[PDB]
Amino acid sequence: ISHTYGWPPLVCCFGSAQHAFVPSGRPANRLLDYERQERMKDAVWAPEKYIRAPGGCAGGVAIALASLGGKAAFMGKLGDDDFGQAMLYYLNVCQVQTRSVKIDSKRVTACSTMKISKRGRLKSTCVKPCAEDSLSKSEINVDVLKEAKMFYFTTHSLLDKKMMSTTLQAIKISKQLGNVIFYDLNLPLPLWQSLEETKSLIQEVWDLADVIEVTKQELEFLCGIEPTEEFDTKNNDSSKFVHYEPETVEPLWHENLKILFVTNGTSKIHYYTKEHNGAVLGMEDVPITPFTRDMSASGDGIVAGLIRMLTVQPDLMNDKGYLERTARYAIECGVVDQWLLAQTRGYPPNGIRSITEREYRTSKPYDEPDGPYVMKPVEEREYRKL
Template sequence: MAEDYAPCDSINDSLNMKEGANDLLVVCFGEMLIDFVPPVCGLSLAEAPSFKTAPGGAPANVAVGISRLGGSSAFIGKLGDDDFGHMLSDILKQNKVDNSGVRFDSTARTALAFITLRDDGEREFLFFRHPSADMLLQESELDVNLLEQARIFHYGSISLISEPCRSSHIAAMRIAKKSGSILSYDPNLRLALWPSAEAAREGIMSIWDQADVIKVF
């Protein structure tokens, strides 16, 4: 499948079209949520004595990581118009991530996830998204200007699970690609969120061949 992806030299040429690597804007798209994490490992969720809150969501984590490493990043997604949602948006700002692409929904809450690390090294997840605000991002709410500035557009697969976010995701990819962005894809499989394993495979693979870079491990 190697011939389906841009070679490193081609990617480097695209990156060098901008003036200096530090001027590159990485726009991350998708979910941002509250993780509830127990203070100790090796327990099931039911056994955990308590939980502490932490910001989560793979695309948002990438945006914060890039900023902390000295890069330029932005996040596009939707949060609940609630205390958790505004806290997460502020966390982006505190970490120097452009949060101008964040939208708030008054009809749905910010997504929650309870996570623990079991004795066997596997993580256990329990999600609350019925629906959550990130699932309700409309195409009309996309920050087109931000997408057109992106040199790299990074996204996952959770935003492909349901409408209207799926259509917004596809539209954002189209805008970014048309503007010359490199498309970076983290499949980030979370089977519990999909209707079935087959639906997950079909959804994840539906945009596979459009990416320039895919995170697989």
């Protein structure tokens, strides 16, 4: 039924439909104007340490891609309980194709049973995984894999043995059907120790990916580079935003890799091919809130923009100008997503109370009678001589 496949091409986002789940967060540097930050420090909230999350789940990327006018399908498993049905409904109202979502009545959404060993030190040793970790090879929807022209997945699917096998099967099936494989690293929290075990885990899927997106911190971690720059210093020196030469990324390259995207948030995006390499500057002075400080929406928007631009013109993956345009578009998408999330969540003052930016930037009247800004009774005046 190839004549029913419309435009834009369908994108399959394989993984988990988590709700506000952050894999990890690393210290980061962003382009910023510090005269403004000094002047606006009483009205604009900033983190004491700038730490940026690489992104979120595959469901978040599917939702973000749909918001850009692209066609996105989410392939995963959800439980039939209230939380799983709520997540499925939320994915449905975001124009994400959920026909590839498997509903399991024997599983609990976002809950796993852990057998804690109480003899030595504390280990958890997961026994029964959650609903979005039990997608079997037989539950993979192959119709959506035939229709889709790009396959998206993250490293969170490689943490469980059975889910890793399912991910490998889905990647191989998609490659057989002539799809472009997009690997979004988004390195999980436990994988930031023992680089060698991370390489052992991700080496098989790394060689099956046509496009790979990693952060600057992830690229440094995988290349064995120690962070030489300074963090949380009020300047924008070029050493914080360095475009590594292709020889630095040479060890990570393989035969079927087309593009490698190295993102530093929405401040800067670096692209690498066999013939071309370059970077595009962006903007990261977006409204930030204690509820939105991890900057995961920016990463989701960047990845969604990259996927959109690569899918709409798949024959220009080696064109340098189109790669520059794609990087700029991804920067813009991340900026817009971060702005929207900041507006939606609001500032801290289901028990969840939030105040708007207008209320956050509202000060006290300073009408305390003891205060020096009120007409006290004439008994106590304290005039100052001219």
